Amino acid sequence: MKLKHLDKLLAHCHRRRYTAKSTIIYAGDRCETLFFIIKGSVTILIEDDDGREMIIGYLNSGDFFGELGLFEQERSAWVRAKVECEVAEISYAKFRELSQQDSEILYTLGSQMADRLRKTTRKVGDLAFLDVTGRVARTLLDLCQQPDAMTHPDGMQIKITRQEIGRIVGCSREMVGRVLKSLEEQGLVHVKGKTMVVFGT
Amino acid sequence: MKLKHLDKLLAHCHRRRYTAKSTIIYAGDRCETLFFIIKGSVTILIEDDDGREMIIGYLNSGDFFGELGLFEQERSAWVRAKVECEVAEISYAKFRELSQQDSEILYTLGSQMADRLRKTTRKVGDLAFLDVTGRVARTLLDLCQQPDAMTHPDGMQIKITRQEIGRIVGCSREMVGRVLKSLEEQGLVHVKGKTMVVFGT
Ligand SMILES: Nc1ncnc2c1ncn2[C@@H]1O[C@@H]2COP(=O)(O)O[C@H]2[C@H]1O
Ligand SMILES: Nc1ncnc2c1ncn2[C@@H]1O[C@@H]2COP(=O)(O)O[C@H]2[C@H]1O
Ligand SMILES: Nc1ncnc2c1ncn2[C@@H]1O[C@@H]2COP(=O)(O)O[C@H]2[C@H]1O
Ligand SMILES: Nc1ncnc2c1ncn2[C@@H]1O[C@@H]2COP(=O)(O)O[C@H]2[C@H]1O
């Protein structure tokens, strides 16, 4: 996508700011538009009738979301604002148009979906083949690649909670605390508050 | 996609017939082309160093596969022929071209990726929230929607093995056999050889 394409999209949308934790998309709702993250981050969640939530992933500035109902549908997952979000909502009708005039816009959307299919297919493998300790270790490493990951002399540090890790791997916060106690005893990470340093990464 | 688009794709490719069980794509290989299923079915697999394989899904006639390395990469998963396959291989270079001339071709690819993201996200939820009995029941129902699913007076019948179900849900064939014994005792299905009837569906 080129700056000229962004310009157009931003010229044909409804802007919206979302405060952290606010729900942008409700699973089940009818799809009618798609979004583009101008600034900030969002969380993709799925959950069982039980209330247990699972974080499928995070999307950041420059990403599109709410695009799965385009080609056809009802919202396939929950999209919640991780941090304050400047978001641009664009109708499916207006999007298919801007895309016919400029194919690179669709190509970029296709690129993002492709990236997500890979990520999600790896998540399937994680849930299928790895134990919790394994998954937690994998999640923390992945989290060190997020844009909110901070740099550190001894590696990388991140702001994260046990609950968030549990949502990502699929286990209680209690078990996460246990895995961390072990990882720390092994000196693989060092936890301190909502902050955590992961050495050598 | 329109018949005219298919015509073009088939005019700019390398045809190949694959016999059932043959590997069409090897995970890890460098991506250079994408495929279009003219006739038949393929299986998407992932696996751990252990040799345990997991069936991520099945694609049928009219589907594209090997498309994740397009927008950018190395093959993200294994693609194996479920049954005899007439396949059309098209280079990424030639595909991006046919797509610029005709955007509907890319739109159809985008539609398929979207469908797969949903399917796979549901698989994540399955592996995250459901027990084996639950997943097996869900898999059998999904299998009743495949094009090879046969019709039946009392419902639907399918050709399937315990090993295949295990690959799909993520458990040994032994456990699958156990779940089936229970499902059958409950008269929810009736197994007979490699054939299995699922009542009321
Ligand atoms: N596995 C996934 N990875 C990344 N984003 C996803 C995943 N599953 C769903 N999403 C999305 O969250 C949105 C929910 O609304 P849609 O179904 O219309 O479109 C969806 C995507 O943008
Ligand atoms: N299989 C699971 N078992 C336990 N918690 C889970 C599972 N899948 C997701 N979770 C969750 O992720 C959260 C971690 O924090 P909690 O333990 O307070 O609550 C948890 C749920 O919402
Ligand atoms: N979750 C999935 N669902 C359906 N097809 C998939 C999934 N993950 C991978 N595939 C694919 O199998 C192919 C492996 O090669 P590619 O990575 O280039 O492109 C891939 C897709 O066509
Ligand atoms: N977590 C798992 N546990 C046991 N088998 C698994 C798992 N994930 C996949 N499988 C598999 O699916 C197959 C079912 O047949 P097998 O039991 O002979 O061999 C199995 C593996 O290849």
**Domains along chain A with CATH numbers:** 4-130 (2.60.120.10), 131-199 (1.10.10.10)
Method: X-ray
- What's the CA gap between A100 and B105, in Å, rounded? 12
The answer to whether B57 and B73 are in contact (CB under 8 A) is no
- What's the CA gap between A195 and B163, in Å, rounded? 44
Q: Does the CB of A77 have a partner CB in chain B at under 8 Å?
A: yes
Q: How many CB atoms lie within 10 A of CB A71?
A: 17
The answer to whether B106 and B69 are in contact (CB under 8 A) is no
Ligand nearest to the CA of B122: 1
Alpha-carbon gap: B134 to the closest alpha carbon of chain A (Å): 13
Ligand nearest to the CA of A56: 1
> Edge-to-edge, what's the strand order for the sheet holding B14-18?
B14-18, B85-91, B33-39, B64-65
- What's the CA gap between B73 and B145, in Å, rounded? 32
- What's the CA gap between B133 and B131, in Å, rounded? 6
The answer to whether B68 and A118 are in contact (CB under 8 A) is yes
- What's the CA gap between B44 and B41, in Å, rounded? 10
Residue B118 burial class via C-beta count within 10 angstroms: exposed 0-12, middle 13-18, buried 19 and up? middle
Secondary structure of A124-174 in HEC code, one letter for each residue: HHHHHHCCHHHHHHHHHHHHCCCCCCEEECCEEEEECCHHHHHHHHCCCHH
Cβ–ligand 1 contact at A105 (below 6 Å): no
Q: A159-165: which pairs have CB atoms within 8 A and are 24 or more residues apart?
A: A159/A194, A159/A195, A159/A196, A160/A194, A160/A196, A161/A194, A164/A55, A165/A136, A165/A139, A165/A140
- What's the CA gap between B19 and B42, in Å, rounded? 11
**Torsion, Cα of A35, A8, A62, B120 (10° steps):** 50
- What's the CA gap between B25 and B130, in Å, rounded? 30
- What's the CA gap between B74 and B177, in Å, rounded? 36
**Torsion, Cα of A146, A147, A149, A152 (10° steps):** 130
Spell out which residues of chain B touch residue A52, defining contact as CB-CB under 8 Å: 129
Residue A91 burial class via C-beta count within 10 angstroms: exposed 0-12, middle 13-18, buried 19 and up? middle
Q: Whose structure tokens read 């890319």? A: B106
